[PDB]
Short mmCIF file of C-alpha atoms and ligand atoms in Angstrom, two decimals:
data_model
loop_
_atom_site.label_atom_id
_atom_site.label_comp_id
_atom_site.label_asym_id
_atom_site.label_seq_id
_atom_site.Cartn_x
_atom_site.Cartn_y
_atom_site.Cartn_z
CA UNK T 1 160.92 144.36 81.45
CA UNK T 2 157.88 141.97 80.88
CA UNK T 3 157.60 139.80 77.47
CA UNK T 4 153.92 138.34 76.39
CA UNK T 5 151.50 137.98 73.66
CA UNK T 6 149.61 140.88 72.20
CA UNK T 7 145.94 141.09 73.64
CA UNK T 8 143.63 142.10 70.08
CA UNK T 9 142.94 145.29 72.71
CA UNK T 10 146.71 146.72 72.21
CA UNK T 11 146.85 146.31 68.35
CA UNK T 12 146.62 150.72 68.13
CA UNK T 13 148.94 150.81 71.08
CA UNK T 14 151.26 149.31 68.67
CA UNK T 15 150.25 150.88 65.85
CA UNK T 16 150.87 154.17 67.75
CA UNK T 17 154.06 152.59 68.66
CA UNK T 18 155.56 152.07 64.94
CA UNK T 19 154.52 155.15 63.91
CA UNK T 20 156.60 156.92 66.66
CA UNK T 21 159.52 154.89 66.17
CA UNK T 22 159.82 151.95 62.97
CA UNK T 23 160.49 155.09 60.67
CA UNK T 24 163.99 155.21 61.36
CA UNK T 25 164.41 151.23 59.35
CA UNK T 26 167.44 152.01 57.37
CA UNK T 27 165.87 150.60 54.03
CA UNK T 28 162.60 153.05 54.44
CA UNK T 29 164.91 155.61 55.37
CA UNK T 30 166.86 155.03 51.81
CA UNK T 31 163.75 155.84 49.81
CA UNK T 32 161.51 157.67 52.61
CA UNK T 33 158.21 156.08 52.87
CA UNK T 34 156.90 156.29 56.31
CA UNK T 35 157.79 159.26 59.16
CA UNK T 36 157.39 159.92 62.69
CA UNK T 37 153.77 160.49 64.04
CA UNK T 38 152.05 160.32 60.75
CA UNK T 39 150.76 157.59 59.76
CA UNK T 40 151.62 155.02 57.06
CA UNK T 41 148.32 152.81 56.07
CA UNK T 42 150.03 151.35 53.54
CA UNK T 43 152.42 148.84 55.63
CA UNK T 44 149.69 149.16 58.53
CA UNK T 45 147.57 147.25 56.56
CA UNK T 46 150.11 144.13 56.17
CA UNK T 47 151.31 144.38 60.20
CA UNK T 48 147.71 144.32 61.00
CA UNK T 49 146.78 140.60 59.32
CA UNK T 50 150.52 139.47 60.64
CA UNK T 51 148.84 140.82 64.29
CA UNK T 52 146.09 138.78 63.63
CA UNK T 53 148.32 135.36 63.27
CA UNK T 54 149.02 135.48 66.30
CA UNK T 55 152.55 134.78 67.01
CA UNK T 56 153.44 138.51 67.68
CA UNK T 57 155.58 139.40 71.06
CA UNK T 58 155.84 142.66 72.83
CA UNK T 59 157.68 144.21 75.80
CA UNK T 60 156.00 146.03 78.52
CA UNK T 61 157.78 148.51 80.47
CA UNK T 62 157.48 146.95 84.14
CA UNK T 63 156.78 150.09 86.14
CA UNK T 64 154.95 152.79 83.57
CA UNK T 65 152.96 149.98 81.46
CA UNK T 66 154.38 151.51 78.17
CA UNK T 67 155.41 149.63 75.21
CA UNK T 68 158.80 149.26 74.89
CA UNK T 69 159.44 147.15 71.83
CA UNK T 70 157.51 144.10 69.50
CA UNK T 71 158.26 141.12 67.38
CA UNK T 72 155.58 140.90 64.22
CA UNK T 73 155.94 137.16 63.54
CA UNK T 74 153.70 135.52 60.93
CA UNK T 75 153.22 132.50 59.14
CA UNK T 76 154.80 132.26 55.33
CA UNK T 77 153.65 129.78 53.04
CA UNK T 78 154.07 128.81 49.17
CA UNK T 79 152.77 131.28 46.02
CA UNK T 80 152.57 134.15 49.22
CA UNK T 81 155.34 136.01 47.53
CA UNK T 82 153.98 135.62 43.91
CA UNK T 83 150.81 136.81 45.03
CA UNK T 84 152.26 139.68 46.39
CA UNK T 85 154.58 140.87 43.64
CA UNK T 86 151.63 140.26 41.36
CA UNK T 87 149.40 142.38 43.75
CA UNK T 88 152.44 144.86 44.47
CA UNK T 89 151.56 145.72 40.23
CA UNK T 90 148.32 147.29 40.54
CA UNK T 91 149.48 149.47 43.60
CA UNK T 92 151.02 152.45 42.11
CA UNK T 93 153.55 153.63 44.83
CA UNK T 94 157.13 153.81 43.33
CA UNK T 95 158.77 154.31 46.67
CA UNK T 96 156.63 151.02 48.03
CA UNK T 97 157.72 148.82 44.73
CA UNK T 98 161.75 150.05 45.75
CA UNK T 99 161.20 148.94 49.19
CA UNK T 100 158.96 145.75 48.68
CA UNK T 101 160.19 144.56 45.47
CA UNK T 102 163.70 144.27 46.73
CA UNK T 103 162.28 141.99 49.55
CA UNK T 104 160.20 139.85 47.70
CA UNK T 105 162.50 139.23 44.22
CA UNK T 106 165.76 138.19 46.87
CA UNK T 107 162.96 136.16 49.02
CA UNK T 108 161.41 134.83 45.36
CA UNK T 109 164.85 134.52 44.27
CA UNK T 110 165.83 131.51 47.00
CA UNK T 111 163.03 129.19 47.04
CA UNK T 112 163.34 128.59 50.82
CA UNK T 113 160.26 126.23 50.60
CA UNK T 114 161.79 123.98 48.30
CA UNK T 115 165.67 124.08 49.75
CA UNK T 116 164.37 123.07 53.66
CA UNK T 117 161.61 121.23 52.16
CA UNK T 118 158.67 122.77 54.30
CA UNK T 119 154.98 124.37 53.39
CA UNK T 120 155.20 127.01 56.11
CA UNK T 121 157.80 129.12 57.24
CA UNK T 122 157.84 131.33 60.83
CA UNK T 123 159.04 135.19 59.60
CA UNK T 124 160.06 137.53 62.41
CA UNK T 125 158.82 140.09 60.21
CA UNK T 126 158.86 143.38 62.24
CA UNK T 127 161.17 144.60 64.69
CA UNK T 128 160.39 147.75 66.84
CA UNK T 129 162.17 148.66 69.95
CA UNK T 130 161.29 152.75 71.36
CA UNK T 131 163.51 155.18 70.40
CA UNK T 132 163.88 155.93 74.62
CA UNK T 133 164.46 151.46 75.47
CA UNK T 134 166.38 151.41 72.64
CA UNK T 135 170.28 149.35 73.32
CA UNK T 136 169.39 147.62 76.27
CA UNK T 137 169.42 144.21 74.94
CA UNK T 138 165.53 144.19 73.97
CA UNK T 139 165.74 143.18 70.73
CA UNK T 140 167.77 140.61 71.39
CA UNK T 141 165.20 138.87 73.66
CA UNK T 142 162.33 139.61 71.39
CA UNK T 143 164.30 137.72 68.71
CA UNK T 144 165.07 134.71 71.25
CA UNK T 145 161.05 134.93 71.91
CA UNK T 146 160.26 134.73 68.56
CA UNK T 147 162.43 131.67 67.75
CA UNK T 148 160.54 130.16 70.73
CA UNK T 149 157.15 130.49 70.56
CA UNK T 150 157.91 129.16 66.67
CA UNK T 151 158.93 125.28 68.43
CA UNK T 152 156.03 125.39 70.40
CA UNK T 153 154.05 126.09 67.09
CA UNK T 154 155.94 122.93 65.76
CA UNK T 155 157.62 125.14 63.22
CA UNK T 156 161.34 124.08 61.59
CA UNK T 157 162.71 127.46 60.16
CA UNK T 158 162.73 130.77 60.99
CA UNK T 159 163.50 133.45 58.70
CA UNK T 160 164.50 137.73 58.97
CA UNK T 161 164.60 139.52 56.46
CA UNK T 162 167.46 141.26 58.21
CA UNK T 163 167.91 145.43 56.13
CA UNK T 164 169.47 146.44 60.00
CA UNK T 165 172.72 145.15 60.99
CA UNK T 166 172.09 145.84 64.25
CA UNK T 167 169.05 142.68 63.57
CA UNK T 168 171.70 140.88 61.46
CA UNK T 169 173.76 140.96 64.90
CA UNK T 170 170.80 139.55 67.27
CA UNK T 171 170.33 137.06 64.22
CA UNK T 172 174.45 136.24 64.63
CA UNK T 173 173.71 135.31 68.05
CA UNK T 174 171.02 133.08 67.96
CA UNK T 175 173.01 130.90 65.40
CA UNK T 176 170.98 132.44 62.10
CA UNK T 177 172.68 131.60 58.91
CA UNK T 178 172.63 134.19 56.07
CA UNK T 179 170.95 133.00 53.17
CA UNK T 180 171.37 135.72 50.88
CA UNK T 181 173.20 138.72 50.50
CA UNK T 182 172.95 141.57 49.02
CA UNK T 183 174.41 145.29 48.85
CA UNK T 184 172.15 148.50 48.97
CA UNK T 185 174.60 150.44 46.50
CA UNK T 186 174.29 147.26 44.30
CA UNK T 187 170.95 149.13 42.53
CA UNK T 188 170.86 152.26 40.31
CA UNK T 189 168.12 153.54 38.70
CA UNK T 190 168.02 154.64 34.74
CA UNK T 191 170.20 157.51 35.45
CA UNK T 192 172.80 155.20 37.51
CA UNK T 193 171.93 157.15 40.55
CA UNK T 194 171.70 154.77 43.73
CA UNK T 195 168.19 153.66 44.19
CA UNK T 196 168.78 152.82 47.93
CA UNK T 197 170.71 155.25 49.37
CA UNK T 198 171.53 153.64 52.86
CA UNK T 199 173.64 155.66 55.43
CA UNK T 200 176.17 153.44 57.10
CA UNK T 201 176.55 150.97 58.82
CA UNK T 202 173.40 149.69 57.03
CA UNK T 203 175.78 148.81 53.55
CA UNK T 204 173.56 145.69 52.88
CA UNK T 205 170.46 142.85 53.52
CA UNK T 206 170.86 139.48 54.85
CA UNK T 207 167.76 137.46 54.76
CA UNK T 208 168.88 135.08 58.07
CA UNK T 209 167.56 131.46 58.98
CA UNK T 210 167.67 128.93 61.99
CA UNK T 211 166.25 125.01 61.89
CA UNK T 212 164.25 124.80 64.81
CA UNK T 213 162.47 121.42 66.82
C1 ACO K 1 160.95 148.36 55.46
C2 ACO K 1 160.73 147.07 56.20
O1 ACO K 1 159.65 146.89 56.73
S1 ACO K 1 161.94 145.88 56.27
C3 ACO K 1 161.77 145.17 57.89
C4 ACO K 1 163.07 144.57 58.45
N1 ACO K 1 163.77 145.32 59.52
C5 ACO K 1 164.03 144.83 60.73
O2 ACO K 1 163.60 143.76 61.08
C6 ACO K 1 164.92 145.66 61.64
C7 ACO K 1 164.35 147.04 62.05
N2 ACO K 1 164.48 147.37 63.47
C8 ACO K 1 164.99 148.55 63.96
O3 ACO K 1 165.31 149.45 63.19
C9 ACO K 1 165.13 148.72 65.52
O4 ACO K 1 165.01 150.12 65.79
C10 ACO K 1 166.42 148.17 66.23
C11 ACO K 1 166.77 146.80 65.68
C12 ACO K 1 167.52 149.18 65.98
C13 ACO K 1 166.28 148.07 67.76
O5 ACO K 1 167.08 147.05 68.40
P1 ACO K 1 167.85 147.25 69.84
O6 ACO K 1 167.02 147.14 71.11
O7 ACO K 1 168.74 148.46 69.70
O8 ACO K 1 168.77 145.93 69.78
P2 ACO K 1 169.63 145.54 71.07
O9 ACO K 1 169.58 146.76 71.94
O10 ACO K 1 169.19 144.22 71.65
O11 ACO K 1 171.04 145.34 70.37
C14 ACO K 1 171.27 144.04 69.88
C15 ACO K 1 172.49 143.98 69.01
O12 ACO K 1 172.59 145.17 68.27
C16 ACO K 1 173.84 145.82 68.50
N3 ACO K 1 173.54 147.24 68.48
C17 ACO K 1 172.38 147.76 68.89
N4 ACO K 1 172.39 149.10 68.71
C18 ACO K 1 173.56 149.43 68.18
C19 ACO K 1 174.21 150.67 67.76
N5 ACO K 1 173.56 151.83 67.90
N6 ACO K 1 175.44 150.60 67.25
C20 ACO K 1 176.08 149.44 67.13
N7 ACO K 1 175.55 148.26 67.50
C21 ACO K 1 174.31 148.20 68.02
C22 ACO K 1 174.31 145.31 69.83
O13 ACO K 1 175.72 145.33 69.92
C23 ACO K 1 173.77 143.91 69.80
O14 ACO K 1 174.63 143.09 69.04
P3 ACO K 1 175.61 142.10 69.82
O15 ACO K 1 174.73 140.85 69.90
O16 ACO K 1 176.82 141.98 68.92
O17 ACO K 1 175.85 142.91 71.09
#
């Protein structure tokens, strides 16, 4: 198992990659957005200009030169989230406003800027391990990776916005703090009918931090 950057010639490799596999997050599973093979431009798009920050760490597998798992890390600053909510408007997917708008109102909702007092902020964004790797401990050094290559950027938080438990748990062992809280079942639509429909253990999202040097 091999962890380095990712070379701008791998960035489909990748791509190929979460298609095969990121599906499966249990918040895009809870309103269906994305699914195996097929491509989703949509998010694509984002992951692509996170790529291109240049932060992002994947595994290798040793012996077959397959990817086995990444670590989308890019760099957050102020009025990023406003402009995307007030972007997220003129897109007119409801499914993508379920999945996004959650994220960015709790993120919105806790000025982590102002409460650390910082102008950017280092956001393991996206985190992928193969469906064949998968529970062999490789998330858990993509996270420790992450939080690394962030102190040699001379950033002093991370943040996750942690929808899997099982990244709530890597987070948990790294020292993260949860910042915020909040239950999947907590949101009905005008019916009353759960709006995020999460099978368990997934029963809610911690967005996670760590002070760094
Ligand atoms: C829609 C959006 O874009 S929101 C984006 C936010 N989402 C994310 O960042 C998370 C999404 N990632 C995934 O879904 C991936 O497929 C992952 C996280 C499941 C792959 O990670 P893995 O390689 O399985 O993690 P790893 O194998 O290192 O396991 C690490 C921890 O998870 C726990 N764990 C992993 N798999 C399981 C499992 N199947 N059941 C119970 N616990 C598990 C381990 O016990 C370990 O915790 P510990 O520190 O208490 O032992």
């Amino acid at each position: 198992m091999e962890y380095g950057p990712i070379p701008s010639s791998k960035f489909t490799d990748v791509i190929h990659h979460l298609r095969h596999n990121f599906p499966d997050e249990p918040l895009n599973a809870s309103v269906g957005l994305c699914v195996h093979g097929k491509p989703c431009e949509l998010l694509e798009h984002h992951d692509l200009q996170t790529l291109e920050d240049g932060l992002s760490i994947m595994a290798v597998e040793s012996t077959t030169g397959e990817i086995a798992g990444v670590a989308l890390n890019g760099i957050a600053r102020r009025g990023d989230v406003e402009k995307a909510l007030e972007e997220m408007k003129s897109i007119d997917n409801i499914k993508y406003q379920r999945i996004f708008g959650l994220l960015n109102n709790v993120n919105k909702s806790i000025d982590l800027f102002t409460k650390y007092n910082v102008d950017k902020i280092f956001e393991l964004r996206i985190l992928s391990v193969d469906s064949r790797f998968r529970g062999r401990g490789i998330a858990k050094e993509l996270f420790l990776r992450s939080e690394l290559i962030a102190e040699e950027h001379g950033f002093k938080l991370v943040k996750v916005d942690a929808t899997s438990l099982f990244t709530q748990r890597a987070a948990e062992c790294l020292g993260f703090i949860t910042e915020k809280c909040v239950t999947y079942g907590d949101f009905k639509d005008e019916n009353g009918r759960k709006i995020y429909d999460t099978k368990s253990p997934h029963d809610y999202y911690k967005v996670m931090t760590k002070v760094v040097s």
